[PDB]
Every structure is written in structure tokens, then in C-alpha cells.
């Protein structure tokens, strides 16, 4: 596909597909939870919820309008869908809501059964999803002390001590046209949208967010949470990994797709090219892993998460992970580099190719708002075509050869080991 | 070989003790502190609660005895000397 991007004081960016049945039409915003402090973690999620709320859903209902709305630590998003014929109501329909009356949605009635909503989503899953919030509690004591530590969602501490006041401040020092992208995807044309805005004179607020005062900073750090009633253990482990707008973007992420996903009741994840996989089937150390690299404005994490029910031979599973990490600074071979090459363009084709015009409408805005335009697929391809075995090596040696750690953990634990013997095993010096 | 006798210690995994629920651990990396900041505020300060905590318990048996010792010597100094002869011939037999 191809994007086109315009400024008229509003910036606007489209994305047309002629074969789309549906349209979608939002504004995404360039605060999220890393913009925020421990007092108001949550006010951002409240948005969101007071955006779905029934009274609002129920007017875009009777003209044929879904809603949508999602929340990360970069960004936030709302946007509209609606028929290919019928895209100018979407905008209105969002006019009513941002630059017009957000005053009828924060009334006293509305806030309080909205709060109640969300203090027992927030309950169930700090209580019943383990992976998830082993993966928060990561972010957590890596990132410590700065803003990137925030969990999405917020906390039952901060959340009951949130008034209707909190949300109105964060609006307007957030919700600015400066800090703004008006997206298009799916059947819409690009003159089409444009034109409909400048029929309206519409204007969110005018700019100048706050400050922001501290970077982030990773921190060698561990966090254990051990509960002897659950069946398993949900063990995550990470290093510092790349930002966007680094040149190593891809060679981290080709890197994660050497040792991949497993699951061990599939029959043919059990068959994949990964060397790991003979020595955790002898015994059948684990249920379940996945290797990750995240990429945010100021940093990065690069790790694998894992769960398993054998819990007297955890140490063998994590030695055994971390000796083949080593590998990819001394002995990476040139099969198990164009293997990933092939996968990784499979992996990134069907996150931006599918079907879903929601879905496109968040990659979208969140890549002009981090780098003023979005690179096609098709340069893509030709930088992961052009890695080398040579460059796989100099990354490791400098991310992944002893260097510092992030854990997390909760379950049956009392299996996994101090520190310093996880610590060592990123360097071999059998060597 | 078979199974021994059952004790009250396992291995990493099953140790044996109660079930823990609600407690949490945090740490941070030898790497990420400042150089041993523990050895001084800890070779004076604490070094001297925990002596005075505890050698009551031992000077007041250590003075019975050497007390004990001295006069012992003392006396056997003075037995065995021009003043003391008398004494001595007593009490032997």
C-alpha cells in the first residue's frame, strides 16, 4: 500500500485499500502511560472506558457505528468504523466527543458506575492472568524509579483516589492538536477526508505538552512474588534491548526468531529448526515459551517468557536457554540466519496485511507520531534481505555477553535461583 | 537402590516447610552498587553494640578464674620462701 501524509494544522494521514468492505476514522494521541506519575497511574484507562460507556455507545448505534479504543505506553487511540458510504457522520459523531461536549460523558452518574467497571477489571487480573501481569511486573523493576515502570491499567491503590477533576487536567494538557493524528483506513480516500475537516474549522487545543523531566534508565533488578496454591511457575527474563528509530530494530528482531515460540501439545511446534528443543524434550522441562523485543521512544527489553508444571528442575531450563544466547557471539551458523530471515518476513506481513482496518489504524498513528512518516513493507524487506552473519555477532557481543538481567516470577519458584548463578551464565568462559 | 527413611529436609523444589503466600522480594544487581559502602558506619558504631551486648557474659566467669589463679600463685610463692617455712611444714603432713 502507500500512505500520504498532509499538514494543514492537522495532521492526516491515510492509508486506502479499494478492497475493504468497511472504513475506519480516529484520532490517536502521543501520551500514554509513560506520561503520567504514581498518583494519577490509571486516568488514561478512564478515558477509554468513559469513551465505551453505554449512553455514548448507544447514540453511534443507531447510525451504524462501532466504537473502539485502546491504551499502551506511548499512545492512545479512538477511533470509529463505519460503512465505505458512510464516513462523513464518523466525523461528527468524534467532533461531539473531543473538540465539542465532554462534559455530558464526565457527569456524576456516568463516573461512578465507570469506576466501579474498571476497579474489578483491574481485580480479576491481578488474580487469574499470571503471564500477563509477570510481564508488567517486569517493566516494573527494570525500568524503576521512571516512567516507563507505570502499568497500563493502573493499580487499586491509585485508581479509588481519582476524581472527576484528575481526568479534566490530564485532558488538557494531553488531548492538544500538537500532540495529534487524524488516521484513515480501509476504503476511504485520502482528498475525501481532508476536505470533509476543512468544511468544519476543527481544532482540538493548540500544543505545548509538559516537559517530561526523567529518562529512562535499566536496572539489574529482580522481583519474585511466590504463591505455593497456583500449579505452575510464569518465569520472564530480559536484557536492554533497542529502541525505534535505531539502526539495530531488525537485527534484534531477527535475533528473537532464531529460538521463537514452542508449545509442547502442538505436534509440529515440536519439529521447528531450533536447537533449544533437544534438551528440553528429554525431559520435558517447560509447557510454553516465546522470545520478545520491545521497542519503545527511550528504550528497549529483549527476553523470552516461559511456563511449566516440572518445578524441581527450573534451574536446568533457564542454564539451558542462556548457553544458547551465548552462541549467537561465538558459533551462529549461516542456516539458522536465513531460516529467521524467511519466518520474520512471514511474522511482519501478517501483523500489517491483515484484514482489520482497527487494527492498521493504530500502526499507523503511532509511527508518524514517533518518526513524521511510515516505512513501506516492501524497504522493510530489503533491510532484513541484507543482514549478515557478521552483524548478528557484533550486536551480541555488545546486548547480550555479561551483561545485566531483569527477572520476574510467581508461582511455585523456591526451584529458581539466586542472582549471581543467573548472572553467570551470560558469559561462558569455557572459552 | 530404594527409597531411606523420610527426614526434615528435601531439595530445590520440596524443602519441606509451610506453604508461603503474600510475600514479596525485591532486589538489585552487585554490578549496579557502589563499592563495599559497608564496611565503615559498621567497624565502629555496630561493632560496639554488639560488644556490649555480650561481654557481661563473659569477663565475669574470666575474673573468677584468674582471681582464683593468682591467689594460688601467690600463695605457693610465699611457702617456698625464708618466712614461709613454717607454714609449710604443717601443712604437708
Redesign the interface.
Known sequence: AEVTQLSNGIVVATEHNPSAHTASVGVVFGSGAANENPYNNGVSNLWKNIFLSKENSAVAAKEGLALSSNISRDFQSYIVSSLPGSTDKSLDFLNQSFIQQKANLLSSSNFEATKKSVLKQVQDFEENDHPNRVLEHLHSTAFQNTPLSLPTRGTLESLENLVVADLESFANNHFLNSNAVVVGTGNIKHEDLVNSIESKNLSLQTGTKPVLKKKAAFLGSEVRLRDDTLPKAWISLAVEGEPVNSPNYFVAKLAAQIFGSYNAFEPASRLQGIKLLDNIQEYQLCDNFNHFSLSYKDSGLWGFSTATRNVTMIDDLIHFTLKQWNRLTISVTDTEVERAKSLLKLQLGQLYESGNPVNDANLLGAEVLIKGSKLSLGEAFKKIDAITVKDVKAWAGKRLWDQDIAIAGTGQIEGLLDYMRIRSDMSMMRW | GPPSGKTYMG?????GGP???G??????????QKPLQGIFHNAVFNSFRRFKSQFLYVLIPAGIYWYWWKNGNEYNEFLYSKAGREELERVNV
Open positions: 531439595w530445590w523444589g520440596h524443602m506453604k508461603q503466600k510475600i514479596t522480594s525485591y532486589a538489585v544487581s552487585p554490578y549496579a
